[PDB]
């Protein structure tokens, strides 16, 4: 995958930047920034999500490389994926972090993001509300005020996406 | 007891539109995230999050061959986040 | 036959969160509203559509009293939109 | 309402801001430019929206200023909203035009915004899902390639918003 190797920032180029609008960020060697990663590749009955080790390599990297740790899970239902969304939330080390990262990537349709053991028939699905729901300020104090990057690889639907036209 | 906004200080940066496919070539990996990738790698230095995300979606504007649109969804970012990569 | 986006371009600027209330004054009007204008009127002219939304998202910041959360929704902008008043 | 004066960018503001990722806006004298306000302030069954004059007379002005011609239709059912959504977007003058906004102030509830027949018993609801696909590049092909901004003035629940601390 990526080396995520990112352009640094210089001493002048943050100065040009800092004013009241931008978010603060900690120091840097008492923080304790926390991503996490969920890929699903594998699945019970979509065809094997081929070339998700490199997004997960270039993910890790970059996100490493813009300090933060980052925690990779794989291959799981919509009901872990709720677990694991809810014990990243709870982590104590938001408390002494300036932001997140929480990046997705499955297959997707329109209703959400899928779990391993999706199928048209029994559909296991995470809905995009439920992150939202599950990173809020009640039941995620500790990033309150706090940037949330959430990112999603995913399908929102089986559409080429398109309109043709002639002229 | 005080009050504290719901919801706030989210982005969401998704692959594709509604009701649309995301491309993921088998070997190179999925587009969208190779392109964020390289977006993030350039301009974390210059630009906020917003700014390189509009900046993803620009190189996405040509619907040739496997076609997508990114999108950016639910904004709550009151302020500029910067990654200050380096610092 | 060419084939385009079918969607590109948009932004959807909401009063109010998901789930969540939006404020008018009955003699003063909607909160968002007046504070959109107010935003508008002073930055149109420095500043792009998104970083004037930025803008009245923040003024919104301190939920003090009847609090809300305006947001930025389905951003398909790829380029920066400045409204040039006067031009 | 507001006067909606409008603050001018000056010649060398608008140089320092002019370079390839910014949308093109076309000639003063030939440009078409439409703004559409949809406004319901009288309902069947939900209490009157008092203050709504002054919503639509401060955009009107906004808009108008920043050089829309401002179209401004009242008290309207969903389905009075989705015909006027798709004349607004098959208007000729958009071919001509280099962007549009549409502003929507009405009560609203999580599955989008309220008609004025809107009632628990009987919904009169207008999916904001729709809007996008009237204004689409199927639906609305003269604005392709250029900025459409929807303004939304509504509820989106009855929830209050927030959640309570004590430290």
């Known amino acids: 995958g990526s080396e995520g190797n990112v352009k640094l920032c210089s001493l002048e180029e943050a100065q040009r930047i800092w004013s009241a609008e931008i978010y603060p960020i900690m120091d840097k060697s008492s923080r304790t920034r926390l991503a996490l990663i969920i890929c ?3 699945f019970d009955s979509i065809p094997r999500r081929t070339g998700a080790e490199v997004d997960i390599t270039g993910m890790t990297m970059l996100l490493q490389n813009l300090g933060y740790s980052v925690d990779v899970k794989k291959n799981l239902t919509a ?19 300036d932001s997140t990262f929480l990046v997705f990537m499955s ?15 029994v559909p296991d699905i995470l809905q995009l509300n ?26 929102k639907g089986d559409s080429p996406g398109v309109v043709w036209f002639k002229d | 007891i005080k009050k504290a906004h719901i919801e706030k200080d989210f982005i969401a ?13 088998p070997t190179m990996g999925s587009v969208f995230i190779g392109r964020l990738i390289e977006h993030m790698q350039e301009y974390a230095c210059s630009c906020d999050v917003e700014e390189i995300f509009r900046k993803v979606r ?3 504007e040509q ?17 500029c986040f910067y990654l200050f990569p380096g610092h």
């Open chain 1, 40 to 42: 699903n590749e594998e």
């Open chain 1, 79 to 97: 009901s872990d994926m709720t677990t694991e969304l809810e014990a990243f939330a709870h982590r104590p080390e938001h408390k002494t972090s």
């Open chain 1, 107 to 121: 297959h997707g349709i329109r209703e959400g993001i899928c779990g391993k053991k999706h199928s048209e028939q």
């Open chain 1, 130 to 155: 439920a992150i939202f729901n599950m990173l809020n300020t009640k039941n995620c104090p500790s990033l309150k005020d706090k940037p949330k990057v959430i990112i999603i690889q995913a399908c």
């Open chain 2, 13 to 25: 940066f998704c692959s594709s539109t509604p009701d649309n496919v995301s491309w993921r070539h």
């Open chain 2, 58 to 60: 620009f190189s996405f």
């Open chain 2, 63 to 79: 619907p040739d061959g496997r076609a997508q649109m990114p999108t950016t969804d639910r904004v709550t970012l009151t302020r």
